[PDB]
């Protein structure tokens, strides 16, 4: 217990390595006693997806799923903290801080990464003391920081040919064309000669913010300032990859957060790099970071007072906060009433009534109607609607169609493919059809193996509801293998006597 | 009706309904699906099977644009209905005759507007269940079948006849077909047809908006109806002088308090009264008398009249205090400033009360004078007058 | 200080109040036009407190939403309980989360209406506080949270009414506040308990639906005609 | 499309022995592994089709040559055992080490000509 609780009062986020996690506390924890496992601190399972599950044996993943369902059933851990560490770092001292950050990152790479590690050692060995060596421990300063000029890494043929670059080599090229203005350290080889490791975007994205901050007001004038402006604008709008846009938005935010020297306002400091925040917000909305899109939209509206109303509606349509969709009023017509009533899923001013009127007056809907019927609870009505759509072929989907397949206990609808990642409704239908069939035929091992197969593939998606399926797997396993007293579902809520702010994620079906 | 249609073809998928019954065709002729075969003419039919057969004949005589073979079909149908002495037969007769006028007259194809049949009694007239049913829906589907093929339209004034569902819905809502959801469905159809057919800026658009807002507010989704009527009324509309819509929206706004009293009185009732003298009818009395109702609700509010009485009390006691103090001269000056502000507020509110009460009494008298239908309000007016 | 930093061109917060306080014996339209002019000079600057001054966008949105929810719940509870003074000083926004805590609830139960310049607005929703929840005005999070608070407070009308009743029989709770006292706060024989509790029942009376009720509340809180009469300064 | 084929099948006309061997094995694998549906999907519909094949169009092959769906092939027995063991059993396949002894002839015709593979490595290439 002390090992478990002391593992978390500090930051010991260092088990991110996939090959080092099955060795770390996910194979030892499985062997630990079940009573001890229940007695372990709750933060072990608080972050159910933060751990990298890239390399895991099948049995370890099965044990992970079982214990995760067990831990969800008691004191659900869906609620999480929102904020992380800030980005602002705190004139010569500013440059000192930037160089300190860069060298700290370099030392971290040196410790983590043998050929590449030796190359980073040589690069750090590349000579003048600017007091920045004090922050790294003096042992590295004495060993590798009189010193041999000859490089201890490569012998003129051992050097890497600078391949295996990242998909985000865009920042690599940008840093290359950027740093070639005033070379303090030939840190240049870290980006052009050390770009071997897929580093090829890690260190580049780590100190691209830093070098861009250096370039701003580096001198009285600089063409590279226009270069950073042009490259930021070119990276914001992009094609064939959302990762480049994500990185560009990250640099934009990182530069906006920094304190601007002799800057009158933090506002204008957010606009140190001349850009239009509206296109950035549109990209962020296309980047699916809706809160970031709203931040860019509100900074733009603070500057230009020129918000894009259609863009704002598109943003507020998908915002995770429950009390959205009502920030902007759309002037009411027979399509705004229907869409506003769909979201509430309410029986008064029946969305069923408006959908029924529109389905014959012919005034998106093929799923909105089905979801309104399902949310209202008229499951047989939704069954009839889905059957009619199937007869007309108009639905032509295997989504909605499977929402009423298991709810109406129609076990003749074929299940979706097990290999493919599938929505929670098809998920639940696959599990429930399996359990129905193996209740009819009675083979317990087959059901266990099928649920294991279906729960193995769900993890890597990083879908919000994976733990919700872990719970269902554990629950049906408990309700199945027991010879009596099959309950294990209400008692938690009876103790709570309320929803206990579980949000729609925790409690649903 | 659409959920009903879903249920019927779902049952047909289960081969359980045996789709030669009444309900299948009651869905068919209402959903305008002219693909299900009609029931045999020699075979005896219910009301709905007969209606669907007649309407399928109308559809196939409107696609090919005829006025004669339709007569043969209708007459051959009307020949063989009466001998069984079915109670609904009379209704069928009415239908036939109405159909006859839709395919004879080159203009104004409808008789008596049906809505006036319910307006003459000035109520629902409560004939009986079997005496009020299902006519307006057939009139609707017939009218929409008139322009099913533009080769059967051959004109533009018909597309303006197309959009006079307002009569049909003022009839269905206030209730021959005996429902309300069908009123909203046909209002949606009229909005779709307006946005589909002709220019999107007229007076017909505003009238359709007003009827839809009425249908919505009676469904008691009050704020949505408020919004839908205000989107078209408080707007730079074409030839905008609609008094009835203005009065109705003012009444609704004061009903749900969605707008200020002074603002609604200056923007939604005075506009109606300025655009008067062009609708001298029962609707004219309806407008002054809904205005009197709103002004009475303004006067008859218990909380605000309680504060009004307390305000009269403090005004009178401040007059007494001024008399006492006139008989601390700087205190007297500060007090006189405070209670002169209080006094001017008192005059403003008392003048407002007098104006609203006198106006509501006068418009109650007008609501009686123009139309004798609304009578009981005189007693109400009496209570607001001899008090 | 946020308005003295972000927009130094416009008038200072002490520049406009004095002229607002200059007109004390005037009609309502004069106050409305002077408030329109002053609020046109002073753009709403509160929205920058949350943005680029707190954290990454996830935390910014979380604290904006939490500020909206807290101010909506506090506003509904102030209306239902007739809470009085709502100065900027008497609201505390927590830098950790942004939720608003109402200190100094010494004027409540219609007492605010008894001040020399009655607080006609139910709860303070001036331009800056409205901007606080973002580009959106008092719509979305604020309106829905107000609706839910009013609906739940009406569901438990019996128990809350009993609680306020036990305050009524409590001799310590002086449902009567001296007028001179009332005056001071703004500057910085009938049993009133039954009248106040009747007012509380009326504010929870279901004659008017909750949706249109909170809509009307928002309307009074935002309509400049009311806000121009709230009080000199008070912003 | 599978339900339509099944409805066409088991009609004594479409359900014929002319179907190539292991096609039913592939269908059973699809129905029990990927679909993994046995409610009228495995051991109910597949079993019915197999029984119809064993009764209708039995011992009368469409083509006598190459033993098409004939009883001489042990592959039919292997498929029968696999289907029998796949009816809701742990390790439902339960099939391993078929012991073909090079009777399957994986390499196609002109396999000696295929062994072109002699010059697999090109001159100074790959």
Residue numbers in the entry:
A (entry chain B): 1474 to 1485, 1488 to 1565, 1573 to 1595, 1597 to 1609, 1617 to 1635, 1638 to 1678, 1680 to 1691, 1693 to 1857, ...
B (entry chain A): 1876 to 2049, 2052 to 2204, 2218 to 2277
C (entry chain B): 2546 to 2733, 2763 to 2809
D (entry chain B): 537 to 651, 653 to 663
What text does the study give?
After incubating the active wild-type ATM/Tel1 with the CHK2 substrate peptide (CHK263–74), and AMP-PNP in vitro, we froze the specimen and determined the cryo-EM reconstruction, which revealed that ATM/Tel1 adopts three distinct conformations. We focused on analyzing Structure 2 of the active state that binds to the substrate peptide, with a resolution of 3.6 Å. Unexpectedly, only one monomer in the active dimer binds to the substrate peptide. We designated the substrate-bound monomer as Mono1 and the other as Mono2. The hydroxyl group of the phospho-acceptor threonine (Thr68) in the peptide substrate is oriented towards the γ-phosphate of AMP-PNP, forming a hydrogen bond with His2632 in the catalytic loop. The glutamine (Gln69) sits in a hydrophobic pocket formed by the activation loop and the FATC domain, where it stacks against Phe2805 (FATC) and forms a pair of hydrogen bonds with the backbone of Val2662 (activation loop). However, the Lys2730 of the kα9b in the PIKK regulatory domain (PRD) of Mono2 occupies the Thr68-binding site, and Gln2731 occupies the Gln69-binding site, thereby competitively preventing substrate binding in the catalytic center. In the active form of Mono1, both kα9b and kα9c are disordered, enabling the substrate peptide to bind at the active site. In contrast, in the active state of Mono2, only kα9c is disordered, while kα9b remains in place, blocking access to the substrate-binding site. The Mono1 N-lobe packing against HEAT 34 R (residues 1583–1610) clamps the substrate peptide and defines a confined catalytic chamber, whereas the N-lobe docking at HEAT 32 R (residues 1470–1483) in Mono2 stabilizes a widened active center and facilitates substrate entry or product release.
